Amino acid sequence: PKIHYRKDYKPSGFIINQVTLNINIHDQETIVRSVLDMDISKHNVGEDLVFDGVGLKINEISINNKKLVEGEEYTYDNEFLTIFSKFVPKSKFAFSSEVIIHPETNYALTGLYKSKNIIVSQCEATGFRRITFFIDRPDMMAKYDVTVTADKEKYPVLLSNGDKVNEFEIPGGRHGARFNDPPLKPCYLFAVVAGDLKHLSATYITKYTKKKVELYVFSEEKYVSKLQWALECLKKSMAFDEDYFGLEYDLSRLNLVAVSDFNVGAMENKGLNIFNANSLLASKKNSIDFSYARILTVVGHEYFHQYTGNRVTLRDWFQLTLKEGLTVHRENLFSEEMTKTVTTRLSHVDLLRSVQFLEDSSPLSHPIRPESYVSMENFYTTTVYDKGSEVMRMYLTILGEEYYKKGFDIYIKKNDGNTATCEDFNYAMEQAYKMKKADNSANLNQYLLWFSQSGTPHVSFKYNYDAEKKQYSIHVNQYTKPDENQKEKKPLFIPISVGLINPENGKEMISQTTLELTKESDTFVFNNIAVKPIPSLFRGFSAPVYIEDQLTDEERILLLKYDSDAFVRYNSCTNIYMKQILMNYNEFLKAKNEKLESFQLTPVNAQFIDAIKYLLEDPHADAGFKSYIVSLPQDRYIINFVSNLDTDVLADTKEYIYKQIGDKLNDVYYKMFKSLEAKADDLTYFNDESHVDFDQMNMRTLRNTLLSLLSKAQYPNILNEIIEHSKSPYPSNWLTSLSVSAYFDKYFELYDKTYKLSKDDELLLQEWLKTVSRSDRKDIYEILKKLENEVLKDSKNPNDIRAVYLPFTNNLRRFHDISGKGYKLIAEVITKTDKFNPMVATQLCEPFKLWNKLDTKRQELMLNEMNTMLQEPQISNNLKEYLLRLTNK
Numbered sequence: 059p060k061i062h063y064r065k066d067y068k069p070s071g072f073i074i075n076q077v078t079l080n081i082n083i084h085d086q087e088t089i090v091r092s093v094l095d096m097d098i099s100k101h102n103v104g105e106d107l108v109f110d111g112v113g114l115k116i117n118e119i120s121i122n123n124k125k126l127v128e129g130e131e132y133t134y135d136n137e138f139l140t141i142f143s144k145f146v147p148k149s150k151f152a153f154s155s156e157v158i159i160h161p162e163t164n165y166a167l168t169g170l171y172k173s174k175n176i177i178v179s180q181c182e183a184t185g186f187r188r189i190t191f192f193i194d195r196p197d198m199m200a201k202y203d204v205t206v207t208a209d210k211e212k213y214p215v216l217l218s219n220g221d222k223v224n225e226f227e228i229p230g231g232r233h234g235a236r237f238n239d240p241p242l243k244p245c246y247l248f249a250v251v252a253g254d255l256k257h258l259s260a261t262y263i264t265k266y267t268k269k270k271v272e273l274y275v276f277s278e279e280k281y282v283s284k285l286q287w288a289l290e291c292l293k294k295s296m297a298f299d300e301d302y303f304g305l306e307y308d309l310s311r312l313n314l315v316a317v318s319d320f321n322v323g324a325m326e327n328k329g330l331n332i333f334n335a336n337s338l339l340a341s342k343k344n345s346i347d348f349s350y351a352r353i354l355t356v357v358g359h360e361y362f363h364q365y366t367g368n369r370v371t372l373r374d375w376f377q378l379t380l381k382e383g384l385t386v387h388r389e390n391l392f393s394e395e396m397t398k399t400v401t402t403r404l405s406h407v408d409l410l411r412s413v414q415f416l417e418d419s420s421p422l423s424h425p426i427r428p429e430s431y432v433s434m435e436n437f438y439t440t441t442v443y444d445k446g447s448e449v450m451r452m453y454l455t456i457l458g459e460e461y462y463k464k465g466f467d468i469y470i471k472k473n474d475g476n477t478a479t480c481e482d483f484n485y486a487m488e489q490a491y492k493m494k495k496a497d498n499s500a501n502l503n504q505y506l507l508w509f510s511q512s513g514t515p516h517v518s519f520k521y522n523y524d525a526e527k528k529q530y531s532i533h534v535n536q537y538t539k540p541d542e543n544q545k546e547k548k549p550l551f552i553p554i555s556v557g558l559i560n561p562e563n564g565k566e567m568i569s570q571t572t573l574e575l576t577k578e579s580d581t582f583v584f585n586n587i588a589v590k591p592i593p594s595l596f597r598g599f600s601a602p603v604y605i606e607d608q609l610t611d612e613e614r615i616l617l618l619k620y621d622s623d624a625f626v627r628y629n630s631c632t633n634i635y636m637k638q639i640l641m642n643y644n645e646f647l648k649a650k651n652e653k654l655e656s657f658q659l660t661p662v663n664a665q666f667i668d669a670i671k672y673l674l675e676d677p678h679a680d681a682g683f684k685s686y687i688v689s690l691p692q693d694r695y696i697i698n699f700v701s702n703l704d705t706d707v708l709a710d711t712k713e714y715i716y717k718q719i720g721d722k723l724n725d726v727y728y729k730m731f732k733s734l735e736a737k738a739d740d741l742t743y744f745n746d747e748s749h750v751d752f753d754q755m756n757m758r759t760l761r762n763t764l765l766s767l768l769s770k771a772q773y774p775n776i777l778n779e780i781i782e783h784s785k786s787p788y789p790s791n792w793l794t795s796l797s798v799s800a801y802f803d804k805y806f807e808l809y810d811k812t813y814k815l816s817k818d819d820e821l822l823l824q825e826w827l828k829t830v831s832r833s834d835r836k837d838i839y840e841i842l843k844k845l846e847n848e849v850l851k852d853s854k855n856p857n858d859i860r861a862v863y864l865p866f867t868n869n870l871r872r873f874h875d876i877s878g879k880g881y882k883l884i885a886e887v888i889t890k891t892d893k894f895n896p897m898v899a900t901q902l903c904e905p906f907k908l909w910n911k912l913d914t915k916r917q918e919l920m921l922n923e924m925n926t927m928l929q930e931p932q933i934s935n936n937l938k939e940y941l942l943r944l945t946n947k
């Protein structure tokens with residue numbers, strides 16, 4: 059397998075100036091004719107002309123309208139088309155080809171493929187070569203002139219990039235459309251869509267040039283009523299880029315298209331963004347609440363690529379985080395402003411510190427700009443995206459809004475229309491940094507280590523207060539564990555947003571302050587500090603690090619109650635929980651290991667429980683925040699702090715802690731569940747798809763979290779509430795009634811009720827599948843067998859497969875059954891899926907990522923299944939490369 063190295067980047071010996079495509083869709087095949095107007099670059103040294111071309115059936119290839127002859131003038135091996143240099147012209151020439159491809163049987167969903175009755179392309183990263191021959195790398199920019207033809211009845215709507223410049227009828231019930239896109243673009247942003255699409259549309263007038271932009275959102279006819287929120291989100295995205303960044307859309311039209319079969323969430327093809335239907339379509343009657351934030355973030359994300367990815371492009375794939383991390387950061391700024399809820403930022407931190415921290419301490423650990431890759435499909439990772447976003451956000455923390463905006467505009471103005479690298483962005487931020495510090499000697503050279511150094515830094519603290527001197531000191535240390543990428547880890551530039559809370563009145567003691575830690579350790583001293591403060595550290599989660607605050611639980615409770623920063627309050631709660639979890643875990647472990655007939659458990663801190671009650675009973679406190687404080691930290695967060703983690707002992711630990719708190723607060727929980735109903739389930743705007751209230755959605759989250767806690771606790775007659783909840787019009791509510799009914803004899807009655815509510819909407823049925831998959835059922839293995847036989851069957855839809863299996867893999871007690879039956883089951887699903895969709899098979903490997911963190915018996919069970927998958931003769935390149943790296947082989 060070819061390893062590509064970042065240091066090996068070299069420009070092509072060739073240039074592709076113009077692409078002229080004819081894509082003729084027929085019943086059993088698609089014919090692709092392509093003329094490439096090419097040239098010889100200054101880097102050419104007489105080499106063979108090598109095109110990428112994967113799975114193409116050649117009808118003919120030509121140079122300057124002279125048919126080429128196979129074996130003597132070119133070789134094709136189903137991966138590379140090699141034209142021997144003797145037959146390669148030395149000046150401007152035309153290469154042309156006609157190939158046959160087969161979208162109908164393209165179940166890997168890369169290149170050109172059929173999703174239900176829609177023909178659709180997915181070309182990022184290296185999928186364009188599955189459509190026609192190309193030098194398939196993002197530094198080959200070309201103009202595109204694309205004609206698509208098809209049966210008019212099956213495919214009345216034809217779309218590609220650029221302006222539709224012709225529409226014409228063809229004998230035999232066919233028709234064509236020609237799309238010309240003069241501005242240069244890389245081939246991974248090419249797209250084509252053909253189908254019986256229905257749409258909503260609007261006109262957006264840009265803020266400064268007053269250009270009219272036509273906005274279209276498309277789906278299959280059955281789901282056209284689910285398009286309205288997406289259109290509203292697109293308008294919102296457009297306005298936010300104008301308002302925050304001063305950036306306007308440059309083209310006359312923007313199309314968004316939903317398809318049912320998609321490997322990921324969505325794709326930013328220029329003027330033609332293509333979406334997983336679950337990330338574009340929603341209605342209040344047929345979607346859970348999560349869909350609304352999902353559509354907002356995904357529509358926003360693809361729109362923000364128009365600058366950060368499409369107008370400023372990548373030189374090579376090693377710069378992926380420069381468009382993905384930066385666009386996630388732009389998307390997070392947008393979402394935070396649109397939702398105006400503190401849980402938006404908390405939810406991104408929660409994902410980073412569980413999923414991405416796990417990845418960064420796994421054998422898969424890599425920096426946000428890796429040094430090498432084998433599979434580009436495996437290159438797309440939470441490290442590149444989400445740690446990338448936190449690295450791009452730290453620039454804003456360091457610079458402040460005004461100078462961040464100045465540096466960002468320097469980046470856009472200097473690189474608009476050109477490729478760029480991570481260094482280019484750092485240079486633009488450095489210029490703003492010089493301006494801010496009024497110091498042209500200031501620099502961000504150290505900041506570049508965030509792109510090259512893998513692993514999560516640990517930041518720890520000690521404090522000193524001299525009452526007589528009124529002098530306060532914060533001593534800070536940073537440390538990154540050595541790994542396979544660096545034997546010696548260098549200190550990073552770590553910005554530490556800090557407040558100092560007066561413990562007597564809860565007030566701020568200093569102005570906003572960002573400590574710039576640039577050494578392995580430093581001491582930050584504050585004078586005129588009138589009383590000993592409680593420090594509020596890493597406000598907003600200001601760096602992607604393990605925070606060791608070294609505070610007592612009494613101090614953390616005070617921050618939880620009285621601090622001004624939502625993250626520090628939530629993190630103080632998290633830290634209290636974590637101390638309790640580790641202590642009880644060790645006590646349960648010892649009792650198991652020593653076969654104790656009796657033992658003691660350390661109870662949950664009573665003042666902590668009192669503080670939870672105090673916040674829950676505060677009517678001015680935020681419902682979303684409340685839902686976070688009654689939930690223990692995620693299992694994948696906990697696992698970063700325990701070696702040889704016994705999942706059974708952890709399940710017993712969580713059970714004890716939840717029972718402790720519930721035994722004190724269940725009556726509070728129940729009272730709030732009842733009092734929240736009126737506002738949480740208000741139907742005033744149920745038939746207004748444009749009216750989305752994130753606060754109300756957070757109140758439903760709180761109710762459904764409380765209902766879960768009360769159901770698990772078998773709170774007296776709570777089943778009455780569950781049954782009434784099942785009649786709510788909101789799917790978040792009636793799907794909640796299914797999963798919380800798992801603890802009752804009514805489960806299968808609600809199983810059937812919610813199935814009939816769900817089965818006639820493709821996306822709702824998938825949410826139903828997830829709810830069943832996630833259900834806390836002792837018979838979950840028989841239930842999964844039932845889903846397989848009755849609902850899932852042989853579906854190759856990734857949404858179907860992921861819905862049935864991934865939630866179950868988070869069932870701590872049952873997926874990790876000591877027999878290994880859960881590992882066996884998911885390995886069978888991975889191997890089966892790998893026959894037709896390697897990239898989704900690799901997604902289904904996610905539960906194995908922590909394999910070497912578990913107890914030794916479960917490590918061996920997991921390792922056995924991965925070795926079994928690795929031994930399959932037909933294993934894909936994706937799956938082999940991933941499991942080889944994951945198993946340290």
Ligand SMILES: O=C(CNc1cc(F)cc(F)c1)N[C@@H](C(=O)NO)c1ccc(-c2cc(F)c(F)c(F)c2)cc1
Pocket residue numbers: 167168180182183184185321322323324325326359360363382434435436438439440441443897
């Ligand atoms: O949708 C999402 C959710 N984020 C995400 C985060 C991860 F860490 C991993 C992941 F998979 C997704 N991201 C978008 C995005 O960034 N849109 O702008 C995206 C992601 C991957 C491809 C792609 C790459 C290939 F090599 C392919 F072969 C292929 F079919 C698709 C296309 C678009």
Ligand SMILES: [Mg+2]
Pocket residue numbers: 112113114115158159160
């Ligand atoms: Mg083929």
Ligand SMILES: [Mg+2]
Pocket residue numbers: 265297300
């Ligand atoms: Mg405006």
Ligand SMILES: [Mg+2]
Pocket residue numbers: 318820855
């Ligand atoms: Mg289907």
Ligand SMILES: [Mg+2]
Pocket residue numbers: 421542943945946947
């Ligand atoms: Mg290794």
Ligand SMILES: [Zn+2]
Pocket residue numbers: 326359363381382385
């Ligand atoms: Zn993206």
